[PDB]
Nucleic acid binder design. Structure first.
Lengths: 104, 77, 96, 91, 96, 99, 87, 108, 92
DNA sequence: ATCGAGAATCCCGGTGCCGAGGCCGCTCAATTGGTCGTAGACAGCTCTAGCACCGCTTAAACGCACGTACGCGCTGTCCCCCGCGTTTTAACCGCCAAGGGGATTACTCCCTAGTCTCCAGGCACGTGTCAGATATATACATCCGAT
DNA sequence: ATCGGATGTATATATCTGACACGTGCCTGGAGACTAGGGAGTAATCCCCTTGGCGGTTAAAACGCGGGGGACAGCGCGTACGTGCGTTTAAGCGGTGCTAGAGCTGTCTACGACCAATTGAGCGGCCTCGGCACCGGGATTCTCGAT
């Protein structure tokens, strides 16, 4: 069996426990910690890819590319708040013009 | 060498930044700013490289330099 | 929800809401803006284009493309009304 | 040899958007993102243990670190997912 | 002959360069600059090719973000022309 | 004999010299402390504070608003205004990335 | 057994002249009358964030009393590190 | 046994090499902590501490006080470019601010 | 019950830079905060360096590097010289 | 414009106090000083990816002209905010009281580090299909005089 | 305001190539089944510092009133930067080829975790006195309405 399958996760609980121990984050790591963490990472992964796939589907493209990740992350308030200082390689920027700059 | 960051290349950056009109003193100012920005990232990246006893600067050396300055860059990690 | 999900929407003439607001409403509702007189599902203006029967609105008429007021989209956003009601109770054109 | 998260990311992608694929650059960004969020939560969970003189990161240090790091509905929903998972895993 | 008015093509460029994602500085002169700056902190270096790409992505992103802040400072002054004082303000508010 | 009056802004400059020389906490202790309790009860009912925890909150707040006012002041001066206005605060916060 | 009645409007406890004094320390010569409500808005947003984190450190400790350390840790993680209350 | 000798006194430091070595282990920073590391770190802490108190005592003397107080720490820090660069995101309790009026605000 | 602080070492250093000068308890509390902050910055960075290079041991080399990253310019060169001079003395 | 009041500031000096420097117990944590296992320093090898350099294309940078719309110095004038006198209200201080809960000690048992044995997961690396990059012609979307 | 022209754009259709999705073999790390000892959950006791409350003084807040100086609208005009052309150069590409050095491998020894016995160093408390704060009175600075 596997700890991921007992949790019902796709994320790798076994690997997460080993990385928590090996990173020297603490003297000890309780069995529930990597389960909770793998669940949280999986959820945030799904929450980004939800939006990134919508951005791709807004467009004609069928595969996610860095542009779609940037548009997703900056359109969503809470992801932009979580990732405010992050730069995404090949993201570009949001389509954005200040109204004062237009004709009339 | 810094004059190799061409006038139109700075205009393109300002355009991506949404800037409509650009007073010509901006180019030399921006060249100054950019050189300071590169000096701090390169000096940190080179410090990671030299710590590791390498001569070749890795992508990870640049990523760690940016990450410690909080300009965290994804996609190369 | 997105009522205009597959629909093309022509904008003609004067609008009280500017072009980008009307385009933003069309996008938020899931539809597609155009300026081309003969390929839309809906046509949009103030009263003026039908009130004058301007040459572009005569093309909309010969295309039988039904016409709604600019502010009728505000109801398409603001209420649970069916598409037919939003294009019958709300209509400018005598054709459609 | 070189471990990553890429296949679990791909399995999550298959759950949220079955038809969608993902470019290699985008997959590299997901590996970057997962490692960042993991390092944030693990760093903060560590600091929580030291401030309370605890030796152990338990699920509760994770839960608190998550409540600290995430804004608003991401925080509320993430905590629910952690609660669901640890509940399901316990039996 | 025909001519666009001042500012029309600048707006056309803003839309273009905000829509695309390519790096905007020519690769080779940026790479050449990076070598000159590195040479002072240590002689006889080498770079991974990807490492110069990471630096270019960083510099272009940082400068673009700085130009957005600079744009606000000019607009606040009721200018549309950015000027060195705007960069100096934005950087000083950022605490650089 | 007309009463002595300083011309406008002259006493404001003297206040700046005074309140930059001194290190006193400028917000009234007790109203600040009531504001802390009033906010706190939105997250958890019937909380308590170490008295020093309230002092630390005030020291943070005074430093934070003072710093923001310096940036606001630069924004006003850059627009050739002497007078600070809400658009300066909105600008200073947006360039800081607090919004 | 006891309780206290819920506190209301204590944001207006941040007096007009207190805001003026902060601006004077900040080097401001002239203040437009619209600044005060805007400033109260900013201060309330700042305090909400610092308190939410500090209360979370207090809850994590299973304490009911917010300590100076809870506040210092909140400020530290928000990148506004305060010396004079730690140690 | 030989007479006990503090690692601080071998290094010529005032700072506690012993306590620093303890904290480097118990802070979980690594599996292992090499015997020179606490000496090097203690020397660096000591140097920076001396560098601040150097300037702070000068500011207290200039303000004609024999005792360093939080005000002098703030003034001494904001008067040095590299300390202010090291501490740009630090708030000092009871510090106040630098005496500074923007030149345009002064009367004609 | 027993606390610990840097306060006596702070006091010793004070007597060396300025013999005549005293220090307030609040100023001493600030120095204890500062010493702990800088200790945690340096040790934190030294941990990352060790981890990035798969080294399990923090050594003087990781500290010397962490200092060149954290401190500005001349303050760094002096700190690195002091750290070096202390270790060569301690090696005796 | 340079010159008298006058108002606030900066400056002596007697008081008198409580915060800082010092001194003493003494508890414990740093040191002394013994194993021993392994992290990592070092040597050797190997192969890949960074640097060098070459010739040709053609995209991009450059330099030039020109005109227009912007920046901005100038004036008016309107009203807001500052400075100053009065009223009032609540912040502040001292002191009083109860008891919530923060800190500590002591148990005991749950669980998590740790070892060993097993096997399936997930990686490295083949490979063929098709998403989307690159035209290429096309049908708009929107700008600019000219009316 | 409309309207025509133009011209820059986003749109269908067609190919085609190289990136990604899937299939494979395998090797090593997770996971199953132990063991055992110490981390931290729970009880119980203490006392401290917090929260509530009261009465009195007087500092600060709120308020009202001028009035002058600042914000900001309007605007005349000098110029500096946008749009566009013809020019030229250096970036790019795809080539080759070399070799430094990043990477993995194998050995072995230097050191740092470990334990334990031991003792001075740093902390917790009690002082006591002098650096500072506090008025009280004083001289100096700077401002303003005269000129």
């Amino acid at each position: 069996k596997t700890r991921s399958s007992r949790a019902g996760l796709q994320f790798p609980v076994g690997r997460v426990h080993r990385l928590l121990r090996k990173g020297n984050y603490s003297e000890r790591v309780g069995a529930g910690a990597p389960v909770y963490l793998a669940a949280v990472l999986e959820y945030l992964t799904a929450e980004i890819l939800e939006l990134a796939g919508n951005a791709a589907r807004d467009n004609k493209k069928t595969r996610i590319i860095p542009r779609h990740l940037q548009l997703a992350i900056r359109n969503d308030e809470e992801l932009n708040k979580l990732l405010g200082r992050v730069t995404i390689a090949q993201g570009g920027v949001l389509p954005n013009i200040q109204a004062v700059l237009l004709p009339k | 060498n810094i004059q190799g960051i061409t006038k139109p290349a700075i205009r393109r950056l300002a355009r991506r930044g949404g800037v409509k009109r650009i007073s010509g003193l901006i180019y030399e100012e921006t060249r100054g700013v950019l050189k300071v920005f590169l000096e701090n990232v390169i000096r940190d990246a080179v410090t990671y490289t030299e710590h590791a006893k390498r001569k070749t600067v890795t992508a990870m050396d640049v990523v760690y330099a940016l990450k410690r300055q909080g300009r965290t860059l994804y996609g190369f990690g | 929800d997105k009522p205009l999900s597959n629909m093309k929407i022509l904008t003609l003439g004067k609008l009280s809401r500017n072009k980008d607001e009307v385009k933003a409403m069309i996008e938020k509702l899931g539809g597609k803006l155009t300026g081309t007189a003969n390929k839309a599902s809906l046509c949009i203006s103030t009263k003026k284009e039908v009130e004058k029967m301007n040459k572009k609105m005569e093309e909309v008429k010969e295309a039988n493309i039904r016409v709604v007021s600019e502010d009728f989209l505000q109801d398409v956003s603001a209420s649970t009304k069916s598409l037919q009601e939003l294009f019958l109770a709300h209509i400018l054109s005598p054709w459609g | 040899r070189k471990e990553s998260y890429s296949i679990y990311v791909y399995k999550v992608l298959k759950q949220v958007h079955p038809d969608t694929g993902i470019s290699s650059k985008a997959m590299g960004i997901m590996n970057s993102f997962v490692n960042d969020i993991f390092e944030r939560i693990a760093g903060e969970a560590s600091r929580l243990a030291h401030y309370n003189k605890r030796s152990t990161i338990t699920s509760r240090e994770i839960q608190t670190a998550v409540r600290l790091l995430l804004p608003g509905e991401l925080a509320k929903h993430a905590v629910s997912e952690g609660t669901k998972a640890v509940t399901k895993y316990t039996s | 002959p025909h001519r666009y008015r001042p500012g029309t093509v600048a707006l056309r460029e803003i839309r273009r360069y905000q829509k695309s994602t390519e790096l905007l500085i020519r690769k080779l002169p940026f790479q050449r600059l990076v070598r000159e700056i590195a040479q002072d902190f240590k002689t006889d270096l080498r770079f991974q090719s990807s490492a110069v790409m990471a630096l270019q992505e960083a510099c272009e992103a940082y400068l673009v973000g700085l130009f957005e802040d600079t744009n606000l400072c000019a607009i606040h002054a009721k200018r549309v022309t950015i000027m060195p004082k705007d960069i100096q303000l934005a950087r000083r508010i950022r605490g650089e």
